Tab-separated table of C-alpha atoms and ligand atoms in Angstrom:
chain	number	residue	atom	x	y	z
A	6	UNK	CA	0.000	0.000	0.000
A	7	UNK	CA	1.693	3.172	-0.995
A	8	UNK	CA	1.952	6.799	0.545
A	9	UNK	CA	-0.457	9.204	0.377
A	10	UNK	CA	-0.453	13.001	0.702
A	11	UNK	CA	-3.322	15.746	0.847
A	12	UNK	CA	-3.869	18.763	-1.237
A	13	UNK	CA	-6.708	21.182	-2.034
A	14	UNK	CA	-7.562	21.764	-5.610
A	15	UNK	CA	-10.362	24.843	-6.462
A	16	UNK	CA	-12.374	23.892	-3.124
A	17	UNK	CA	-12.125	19.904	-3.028
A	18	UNK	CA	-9.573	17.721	-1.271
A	19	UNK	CA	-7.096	15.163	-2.869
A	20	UNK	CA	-5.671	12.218	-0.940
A	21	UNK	CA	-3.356	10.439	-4.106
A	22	UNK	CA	-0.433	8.483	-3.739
A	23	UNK	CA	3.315	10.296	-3.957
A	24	UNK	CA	3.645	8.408	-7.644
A	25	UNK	CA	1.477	11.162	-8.741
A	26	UNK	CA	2.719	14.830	-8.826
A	27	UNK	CA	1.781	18.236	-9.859
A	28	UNK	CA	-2.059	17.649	-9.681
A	29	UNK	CA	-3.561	20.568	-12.255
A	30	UNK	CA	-6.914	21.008	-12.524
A	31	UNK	CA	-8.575	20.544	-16.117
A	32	UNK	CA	-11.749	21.447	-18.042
A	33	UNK	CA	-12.949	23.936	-15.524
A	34	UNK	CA	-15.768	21.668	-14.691
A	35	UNK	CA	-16.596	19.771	-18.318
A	36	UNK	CA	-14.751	16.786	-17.146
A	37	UNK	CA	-15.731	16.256	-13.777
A	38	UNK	CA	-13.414	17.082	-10.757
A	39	UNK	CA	-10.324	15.484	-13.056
A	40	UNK	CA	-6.224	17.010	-12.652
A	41	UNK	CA	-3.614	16.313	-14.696
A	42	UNK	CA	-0.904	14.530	-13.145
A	43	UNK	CA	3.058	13.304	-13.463
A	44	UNK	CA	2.973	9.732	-13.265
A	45	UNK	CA	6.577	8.985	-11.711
A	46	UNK	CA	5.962	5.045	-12.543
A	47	UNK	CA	5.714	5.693	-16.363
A	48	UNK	CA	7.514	9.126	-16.866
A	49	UNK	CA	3.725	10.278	-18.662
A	50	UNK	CA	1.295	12.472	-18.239
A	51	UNK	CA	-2.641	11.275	-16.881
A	52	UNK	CA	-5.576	12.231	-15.686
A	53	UNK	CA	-6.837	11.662	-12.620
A	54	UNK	CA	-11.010	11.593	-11.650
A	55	UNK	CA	-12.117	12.205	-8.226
A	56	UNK	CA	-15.533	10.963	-8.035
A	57	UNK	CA	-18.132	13.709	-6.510
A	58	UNK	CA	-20.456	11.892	-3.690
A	59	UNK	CA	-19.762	8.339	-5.281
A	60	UNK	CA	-22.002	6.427	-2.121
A	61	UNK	CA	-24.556	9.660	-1.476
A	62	UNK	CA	-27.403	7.419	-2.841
A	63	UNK	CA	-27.823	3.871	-3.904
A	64	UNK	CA	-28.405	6.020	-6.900
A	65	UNK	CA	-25.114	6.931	-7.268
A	66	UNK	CA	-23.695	4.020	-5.442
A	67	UNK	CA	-25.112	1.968	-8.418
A	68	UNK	CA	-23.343	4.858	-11.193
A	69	UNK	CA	-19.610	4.375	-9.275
A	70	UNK	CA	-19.904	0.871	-9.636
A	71	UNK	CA	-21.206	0.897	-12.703
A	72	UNK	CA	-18.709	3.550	-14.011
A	73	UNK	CA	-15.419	1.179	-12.066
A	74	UNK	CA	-16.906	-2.154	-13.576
A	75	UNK	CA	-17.222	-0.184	-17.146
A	76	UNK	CA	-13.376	1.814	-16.991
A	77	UNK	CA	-12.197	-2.045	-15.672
A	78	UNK	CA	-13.533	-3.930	-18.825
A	79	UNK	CA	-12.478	-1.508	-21.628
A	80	UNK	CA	-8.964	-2.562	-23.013
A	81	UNK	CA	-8.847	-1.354	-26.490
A	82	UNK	CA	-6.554	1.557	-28.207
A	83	UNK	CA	-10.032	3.720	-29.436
A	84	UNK	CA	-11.822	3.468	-25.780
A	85	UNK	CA	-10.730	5.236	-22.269
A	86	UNK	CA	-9.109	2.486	-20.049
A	87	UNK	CA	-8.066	2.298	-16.283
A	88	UNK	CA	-4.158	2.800	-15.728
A	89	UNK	CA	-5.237	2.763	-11.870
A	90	UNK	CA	-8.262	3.038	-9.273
A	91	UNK	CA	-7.515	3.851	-5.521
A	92	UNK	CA	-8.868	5.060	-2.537
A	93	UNK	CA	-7.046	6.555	0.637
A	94	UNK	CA	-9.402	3.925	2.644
A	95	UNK	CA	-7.131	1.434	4.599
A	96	UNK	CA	-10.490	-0.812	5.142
A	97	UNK	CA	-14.478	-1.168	3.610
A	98	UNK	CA	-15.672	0.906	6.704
A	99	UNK	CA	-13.298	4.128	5.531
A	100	UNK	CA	-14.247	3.507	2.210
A	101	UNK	CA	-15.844	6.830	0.874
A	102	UNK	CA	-13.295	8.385	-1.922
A	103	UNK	CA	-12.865	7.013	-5.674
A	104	UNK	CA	-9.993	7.607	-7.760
A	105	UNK	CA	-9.731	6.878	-11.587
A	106	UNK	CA	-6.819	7.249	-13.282
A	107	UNK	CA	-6.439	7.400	-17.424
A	108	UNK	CA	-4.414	8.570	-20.110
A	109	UNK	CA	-4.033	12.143	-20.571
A	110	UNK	CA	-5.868	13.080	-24.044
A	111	UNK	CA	-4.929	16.497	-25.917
A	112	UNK	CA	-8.355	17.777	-27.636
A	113	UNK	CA	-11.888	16.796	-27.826
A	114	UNK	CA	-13.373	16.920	-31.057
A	115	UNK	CA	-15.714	19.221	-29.801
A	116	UNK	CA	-12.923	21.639	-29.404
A	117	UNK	CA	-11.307	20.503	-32.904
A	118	UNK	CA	-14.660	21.547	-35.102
A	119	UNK	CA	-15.213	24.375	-33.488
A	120	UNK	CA	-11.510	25.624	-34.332
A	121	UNK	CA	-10.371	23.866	-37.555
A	122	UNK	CA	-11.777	22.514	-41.072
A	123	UNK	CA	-10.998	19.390	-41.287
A	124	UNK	CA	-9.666	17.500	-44.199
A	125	UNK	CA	-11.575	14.466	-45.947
A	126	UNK	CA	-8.186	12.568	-44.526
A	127	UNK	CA	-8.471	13.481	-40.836
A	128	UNK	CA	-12.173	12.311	-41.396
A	129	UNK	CA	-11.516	9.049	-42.647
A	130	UNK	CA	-8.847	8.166	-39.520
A	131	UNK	CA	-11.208	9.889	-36.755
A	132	UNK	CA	-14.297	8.188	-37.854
A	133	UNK	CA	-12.425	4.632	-38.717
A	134	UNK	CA	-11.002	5.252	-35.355
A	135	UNK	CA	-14.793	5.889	-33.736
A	136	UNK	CA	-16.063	2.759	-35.568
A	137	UNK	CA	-13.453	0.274	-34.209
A	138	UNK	CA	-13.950	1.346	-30.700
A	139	UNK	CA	-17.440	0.816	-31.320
A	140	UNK	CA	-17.222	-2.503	-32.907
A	141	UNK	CA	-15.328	-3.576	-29.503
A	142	UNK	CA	-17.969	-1.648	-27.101
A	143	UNK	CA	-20.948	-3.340	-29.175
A	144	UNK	CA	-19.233	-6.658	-28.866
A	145	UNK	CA	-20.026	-6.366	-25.446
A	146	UNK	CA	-23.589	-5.808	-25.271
A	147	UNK	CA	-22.422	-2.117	-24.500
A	148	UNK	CA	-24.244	0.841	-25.657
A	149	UNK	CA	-22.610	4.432	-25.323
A	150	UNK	CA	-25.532	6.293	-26.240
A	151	UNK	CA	-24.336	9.607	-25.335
A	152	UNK	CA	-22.253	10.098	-28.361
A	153	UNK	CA	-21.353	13.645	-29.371
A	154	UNK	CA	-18.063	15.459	-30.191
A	155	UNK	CA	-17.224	16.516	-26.570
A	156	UNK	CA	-16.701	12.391	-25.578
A	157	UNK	CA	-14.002	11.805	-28.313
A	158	UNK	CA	-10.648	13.060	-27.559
A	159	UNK	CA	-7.571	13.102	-29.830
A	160	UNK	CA	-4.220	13.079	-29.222
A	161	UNK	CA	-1.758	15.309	-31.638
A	162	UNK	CA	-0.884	12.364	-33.323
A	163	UNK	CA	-5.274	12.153	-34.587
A	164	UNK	CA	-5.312	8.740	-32.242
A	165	UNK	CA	-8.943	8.727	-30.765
A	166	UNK	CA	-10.386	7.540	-27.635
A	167	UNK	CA	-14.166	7.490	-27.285
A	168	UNK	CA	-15.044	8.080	-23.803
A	169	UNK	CA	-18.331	9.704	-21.627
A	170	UNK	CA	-18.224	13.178	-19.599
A	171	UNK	CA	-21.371	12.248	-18.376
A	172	UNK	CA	-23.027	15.630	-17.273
A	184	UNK	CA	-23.369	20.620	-27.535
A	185	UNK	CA	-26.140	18.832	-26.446
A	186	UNK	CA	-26.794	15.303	-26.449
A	187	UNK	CA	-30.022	15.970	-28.384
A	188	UNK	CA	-27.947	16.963	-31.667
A	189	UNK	CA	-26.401	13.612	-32.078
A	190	UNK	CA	-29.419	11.145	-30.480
A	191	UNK	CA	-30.883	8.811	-33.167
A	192	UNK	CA	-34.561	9.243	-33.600
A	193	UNK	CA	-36.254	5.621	-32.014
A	194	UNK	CA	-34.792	7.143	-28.614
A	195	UNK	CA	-35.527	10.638	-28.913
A	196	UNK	CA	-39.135	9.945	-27.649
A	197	UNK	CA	-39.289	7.700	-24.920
A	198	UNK	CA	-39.699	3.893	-25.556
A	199	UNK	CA	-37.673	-0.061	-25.619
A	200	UNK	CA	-37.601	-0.672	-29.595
A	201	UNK	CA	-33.716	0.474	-29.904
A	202	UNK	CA	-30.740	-1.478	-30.444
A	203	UNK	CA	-26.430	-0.884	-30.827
A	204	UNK	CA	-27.002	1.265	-33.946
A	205	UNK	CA	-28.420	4.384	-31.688
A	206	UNK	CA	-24.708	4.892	-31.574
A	207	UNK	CA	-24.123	4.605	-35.113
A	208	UNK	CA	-26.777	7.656	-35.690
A	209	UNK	CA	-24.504	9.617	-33.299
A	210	UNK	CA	-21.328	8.840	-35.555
A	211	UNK	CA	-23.375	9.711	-38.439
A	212	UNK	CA	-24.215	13.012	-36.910
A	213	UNK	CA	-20.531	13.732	-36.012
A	214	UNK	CA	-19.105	12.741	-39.390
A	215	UNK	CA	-21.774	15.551	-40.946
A	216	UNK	CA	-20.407	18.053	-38.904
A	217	UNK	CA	-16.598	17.215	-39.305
A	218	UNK	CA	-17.154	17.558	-43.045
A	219	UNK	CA	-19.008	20.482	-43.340
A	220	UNK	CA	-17.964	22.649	-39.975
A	221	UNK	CA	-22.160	22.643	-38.752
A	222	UNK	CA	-24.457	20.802	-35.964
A	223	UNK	CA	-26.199	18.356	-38.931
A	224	UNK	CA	-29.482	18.450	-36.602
A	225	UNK	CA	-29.241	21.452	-34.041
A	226	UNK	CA	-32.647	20.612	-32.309
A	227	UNK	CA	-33.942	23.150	-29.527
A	228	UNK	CA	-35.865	20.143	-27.971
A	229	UNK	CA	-36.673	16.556	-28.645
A	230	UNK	CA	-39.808	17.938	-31.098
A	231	UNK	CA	-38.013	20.365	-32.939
A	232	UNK	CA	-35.263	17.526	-32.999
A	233	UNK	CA	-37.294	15.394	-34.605
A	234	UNK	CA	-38.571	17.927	-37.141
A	235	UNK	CA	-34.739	18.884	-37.771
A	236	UNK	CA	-33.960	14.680	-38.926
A	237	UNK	CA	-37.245	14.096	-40.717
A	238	UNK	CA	-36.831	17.255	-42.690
A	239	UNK	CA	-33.452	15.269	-43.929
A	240	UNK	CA	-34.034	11.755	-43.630
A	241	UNK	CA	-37.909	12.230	-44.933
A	242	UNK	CA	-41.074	11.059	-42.800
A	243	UNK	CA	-41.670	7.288	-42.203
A	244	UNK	CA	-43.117	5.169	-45.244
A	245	UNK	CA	-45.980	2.611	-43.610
A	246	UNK	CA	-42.889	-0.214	-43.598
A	247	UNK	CA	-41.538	2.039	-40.764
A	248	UNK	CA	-44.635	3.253	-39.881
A	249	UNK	CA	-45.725	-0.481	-38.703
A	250	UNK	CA	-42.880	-0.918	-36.066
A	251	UNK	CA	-43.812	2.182	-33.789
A	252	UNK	CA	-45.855	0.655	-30.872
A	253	UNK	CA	-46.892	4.019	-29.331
A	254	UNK	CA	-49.792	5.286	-30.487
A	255	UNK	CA	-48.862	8.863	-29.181
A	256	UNK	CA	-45.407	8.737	-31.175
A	257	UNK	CA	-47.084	7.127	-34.029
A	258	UNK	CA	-49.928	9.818	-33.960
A	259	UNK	CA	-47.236	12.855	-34.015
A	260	UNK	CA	-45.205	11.542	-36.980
A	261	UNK	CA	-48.397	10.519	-39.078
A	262	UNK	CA	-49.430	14.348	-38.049
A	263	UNK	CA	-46.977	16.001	-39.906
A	264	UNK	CA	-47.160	17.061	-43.582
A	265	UNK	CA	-45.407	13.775	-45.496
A	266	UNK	CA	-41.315	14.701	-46.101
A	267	UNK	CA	-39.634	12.924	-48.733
A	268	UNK	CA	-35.771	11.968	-48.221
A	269	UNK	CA	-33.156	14.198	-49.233
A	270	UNK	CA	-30.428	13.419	-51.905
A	271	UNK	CA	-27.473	13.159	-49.519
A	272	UNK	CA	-25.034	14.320	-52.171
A	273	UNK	CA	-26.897	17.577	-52.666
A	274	UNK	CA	-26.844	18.673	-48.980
A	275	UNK	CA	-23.211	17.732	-48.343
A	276	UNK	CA	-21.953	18.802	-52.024
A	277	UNK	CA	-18.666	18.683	-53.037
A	278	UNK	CA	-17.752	15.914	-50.124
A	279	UNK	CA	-16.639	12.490	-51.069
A	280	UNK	CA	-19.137	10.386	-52.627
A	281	UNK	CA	-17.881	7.445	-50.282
A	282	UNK	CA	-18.598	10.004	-47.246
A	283	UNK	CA	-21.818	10.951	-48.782
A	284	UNK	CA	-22.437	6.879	-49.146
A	285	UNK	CA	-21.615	6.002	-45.666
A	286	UNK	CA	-23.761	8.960	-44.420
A	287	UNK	CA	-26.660	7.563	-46.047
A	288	UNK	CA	-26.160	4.288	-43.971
A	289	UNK	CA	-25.551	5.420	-40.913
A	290	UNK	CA	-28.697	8.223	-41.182
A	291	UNK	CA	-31.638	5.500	-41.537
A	292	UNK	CA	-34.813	6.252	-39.822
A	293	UNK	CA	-35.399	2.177	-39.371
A	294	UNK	CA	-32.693	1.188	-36.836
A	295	UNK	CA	-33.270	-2.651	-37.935
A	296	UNK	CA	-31.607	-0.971	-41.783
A	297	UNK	CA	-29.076	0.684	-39.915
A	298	UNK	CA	-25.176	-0.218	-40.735
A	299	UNK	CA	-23.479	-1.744	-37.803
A	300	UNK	CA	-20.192	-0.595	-37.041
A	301	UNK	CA	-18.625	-3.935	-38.070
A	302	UNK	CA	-20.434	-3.681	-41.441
A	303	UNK	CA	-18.984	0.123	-41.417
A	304	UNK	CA	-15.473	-0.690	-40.978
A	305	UNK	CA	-15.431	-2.670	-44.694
A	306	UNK	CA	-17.509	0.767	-45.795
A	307	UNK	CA	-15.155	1.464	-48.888
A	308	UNK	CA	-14.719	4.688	-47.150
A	309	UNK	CA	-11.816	3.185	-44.944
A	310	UNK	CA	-10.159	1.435	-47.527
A	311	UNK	CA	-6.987	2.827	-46.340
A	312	UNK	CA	-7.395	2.133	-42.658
A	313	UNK	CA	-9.655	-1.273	-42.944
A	314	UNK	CA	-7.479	-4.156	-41.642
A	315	UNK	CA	-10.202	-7.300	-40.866
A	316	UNK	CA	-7.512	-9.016	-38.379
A	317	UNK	CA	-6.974	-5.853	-36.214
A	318	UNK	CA	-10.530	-5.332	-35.467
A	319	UNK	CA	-10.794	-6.741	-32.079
A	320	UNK	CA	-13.522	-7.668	-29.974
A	321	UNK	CA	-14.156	-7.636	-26.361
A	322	UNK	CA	-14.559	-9.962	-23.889
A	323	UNK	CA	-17.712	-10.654	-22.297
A	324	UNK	CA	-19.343	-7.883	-20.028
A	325	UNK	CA	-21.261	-9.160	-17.195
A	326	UNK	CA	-23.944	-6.515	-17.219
A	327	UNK	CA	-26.772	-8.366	-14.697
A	328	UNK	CA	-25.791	-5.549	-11.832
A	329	UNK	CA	-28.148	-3.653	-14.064
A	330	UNK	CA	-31.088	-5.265	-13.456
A	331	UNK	CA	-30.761	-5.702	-9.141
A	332	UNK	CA	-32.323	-2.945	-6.451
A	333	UNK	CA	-29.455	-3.474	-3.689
A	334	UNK	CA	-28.867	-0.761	-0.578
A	335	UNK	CA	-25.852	1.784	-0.713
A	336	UNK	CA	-23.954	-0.264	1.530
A	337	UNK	CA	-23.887	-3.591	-0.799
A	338	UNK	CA	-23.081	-1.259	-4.177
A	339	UNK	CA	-20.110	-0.083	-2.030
A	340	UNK	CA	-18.662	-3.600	-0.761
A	341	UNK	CA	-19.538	-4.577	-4.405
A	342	UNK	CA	-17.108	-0.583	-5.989
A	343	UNK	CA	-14.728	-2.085	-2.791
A	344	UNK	CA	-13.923	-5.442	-4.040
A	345	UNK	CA	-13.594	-3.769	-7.674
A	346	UNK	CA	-11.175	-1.415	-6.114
A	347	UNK	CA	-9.163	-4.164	-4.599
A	348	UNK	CA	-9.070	-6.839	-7.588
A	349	UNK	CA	-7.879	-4.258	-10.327
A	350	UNK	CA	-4.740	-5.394	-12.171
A	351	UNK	CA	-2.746	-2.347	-13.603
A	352	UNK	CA	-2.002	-2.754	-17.196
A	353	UNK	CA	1.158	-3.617	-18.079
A	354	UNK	CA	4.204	-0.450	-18.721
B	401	LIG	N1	-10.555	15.177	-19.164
B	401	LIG	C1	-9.752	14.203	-19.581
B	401	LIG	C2	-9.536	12.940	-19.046
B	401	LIG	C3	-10.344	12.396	-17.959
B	401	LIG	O1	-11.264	13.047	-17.473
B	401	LIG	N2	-10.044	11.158	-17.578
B	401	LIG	C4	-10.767	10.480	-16.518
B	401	LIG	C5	-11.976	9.747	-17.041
B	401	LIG	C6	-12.654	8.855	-16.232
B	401	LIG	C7	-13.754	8.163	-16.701
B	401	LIG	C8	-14.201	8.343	-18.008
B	401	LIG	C9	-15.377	7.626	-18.588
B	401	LIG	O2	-15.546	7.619	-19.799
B	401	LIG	N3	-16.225	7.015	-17.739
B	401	LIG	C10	-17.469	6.402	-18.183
B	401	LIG	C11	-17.374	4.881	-18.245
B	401	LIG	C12	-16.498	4.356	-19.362
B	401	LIG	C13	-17.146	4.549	-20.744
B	401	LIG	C14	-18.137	3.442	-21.077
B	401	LIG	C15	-18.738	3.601	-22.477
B	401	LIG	C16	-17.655	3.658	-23.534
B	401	LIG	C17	-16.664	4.766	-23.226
B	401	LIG	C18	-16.076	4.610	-21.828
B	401	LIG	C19	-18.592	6.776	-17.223
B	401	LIG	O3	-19.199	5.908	-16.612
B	401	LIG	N4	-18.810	8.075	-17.058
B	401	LIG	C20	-19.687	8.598	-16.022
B	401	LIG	C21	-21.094	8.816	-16.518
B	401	LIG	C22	-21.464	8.464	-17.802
B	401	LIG	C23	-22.766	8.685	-18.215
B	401	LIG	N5	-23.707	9.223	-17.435
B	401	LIG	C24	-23.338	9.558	-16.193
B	401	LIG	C25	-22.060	9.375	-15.701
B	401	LIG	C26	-13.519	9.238	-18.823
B	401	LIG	C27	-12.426	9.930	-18.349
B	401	LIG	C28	-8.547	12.364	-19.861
B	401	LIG	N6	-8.180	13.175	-20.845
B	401	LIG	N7	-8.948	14.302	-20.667
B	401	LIG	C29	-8.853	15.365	-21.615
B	401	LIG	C30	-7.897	16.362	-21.447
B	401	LIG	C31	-7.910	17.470	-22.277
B	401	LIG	C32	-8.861	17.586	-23.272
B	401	LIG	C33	-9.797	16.585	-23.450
B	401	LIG	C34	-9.797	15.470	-22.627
């Protein structure tokens, strides 16, 4: 068990191990409570995540665990992953703090569209990049479904790591089966998102700038064109199915004449990815052999994940148990290797 020392950073306390030096607050708030550190172990740069009020609630109780198991799982060059997890508790009855510790990323994309144009190269490698970190998520019965350009961070070298802020709004990049509430939604939610996010790395704009989930809705129809009766015949809520049917019929735009003068393999892959029916949707396996990524596409370094044991998600427990249950986490974790 290592040493520990105390500091206060912008009105919260910090009890991390010595291995980690000049602790610099980041994001001013967009991130979390999250420094920048020296890792004297590795020589590099991280970041390290206090979590805020982890065991406040079972509420979130259930979220730290959830977030630990989640961090724990992901080992894959396009997702966040845990270089460490610790806690100044010396037993489970002290246990009350939450440490996460990660690479250090340079940008989010957020940040990057919002100050450059980017090329139709840097789109290619940032999407492919988006798509096999999906493909390994998805493998796993894992569903981001918060996708948007400020949970993608880039390095100055354009690697990508997807990753989730938690709490540009969400709204923009949600696919349209989940903007009103209901169950009939699958893995390709995500692959709207990435649809969204491609639009607006080639051509500088929110594709769908919604001012609420109607408007939203209005915003992708007026693009994607109202349901036929083939779509029409899959939406189980008669107050969902009543709106759409109550709005003057939209045909579907040609994709190549709203995002003129892009690639035509861009402009192709759009049109899969932006599908009203989320059974028609691409997956982000099928998206990876997209002729788009001809370049980057390489079948046998495509990886999947292990198995995620997601049934936590389903049980009503007390504070106390999701805490043992973080604890336990805590203590089994097996750094990566240097
Ligand atoms: N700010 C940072 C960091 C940093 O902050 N690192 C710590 C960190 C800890 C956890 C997570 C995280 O993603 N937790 C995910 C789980 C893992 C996911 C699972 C789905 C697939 C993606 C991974 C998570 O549960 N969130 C909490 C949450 C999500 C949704 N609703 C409510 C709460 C991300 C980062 C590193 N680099 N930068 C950086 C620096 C400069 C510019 C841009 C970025």
């Amino acid at each position: 068990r290592p040493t520990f020392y105390r500091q206060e950073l912008n009105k919260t306390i910090w009890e991390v191990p010595e291995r980690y030096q000049n602790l610099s607050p980041v994001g001013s708030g967009a991130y979390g409570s999250v420094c920048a550190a020296f890792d004297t172990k590795t020589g590099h740069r991280v970041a390290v995540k206090k979590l805020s009020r982890p065991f406040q609630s079972i509420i979130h109780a259930k979220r730290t665990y959830r977030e630990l198991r989640l961090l724990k799982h992901m080992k894959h060059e396009n997702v966040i992953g845990l270089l460490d997890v610790f806690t100044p508790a010396r037993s489970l009855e002290e246990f009350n703090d939450v440490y996460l510790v990660t690479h250090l990323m340079g940008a989010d994309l957020n940040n990057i569209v919002k100050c450059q144009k980017l090329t139709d190269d840097h789109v290619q490698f940032l999407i492919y990049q988006i798509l096999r970190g999906l493909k390994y998520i998805h493998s796993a019965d894992i569903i981001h479904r918060d996708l948007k350009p400020s949970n993608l961070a880039v390095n100055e070298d354009c690697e990508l790591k997807i990753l989730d802020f938690g709490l540009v709004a969400t709204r923009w990049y949600r696919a349209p089966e989940i903007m009103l509430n209901w169950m009939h939604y699958n893995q390709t939610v995500d692959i709207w998102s990435v649809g969204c996010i491609m639009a607006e790395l080639l051509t500088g704009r929110t594709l769908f700038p919604g001012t609420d989930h109607i408007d939203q809705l209005k915003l992708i129809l007026r693009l994607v064109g109202t349901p036929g009766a083939e779509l029409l015949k899959k939406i189980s809520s008669e107050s969902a199915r009543n709106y759409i049917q109550s709005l003057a019929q939209m045909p579907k735009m040609n994709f190549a004449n709203v995002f003129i003068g892009a690639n035509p393999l861009a402009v192709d892959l759009l049109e899969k990815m932006l599908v009203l029916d989320s059974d028609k949707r691409i997956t982000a396996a099928q998206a990876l052999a997209h002729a788009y990524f001809a370049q980057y596409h390489d079948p046998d370094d495509e990886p999947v994940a292990d198995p995620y044991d997601q049934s936590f998600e389903s049980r009503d427990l007390l504070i106390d148990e999701w805490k043992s249950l973080t604890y336990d986490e805590v203590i089994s974790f097996v750094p990566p290797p240097l």
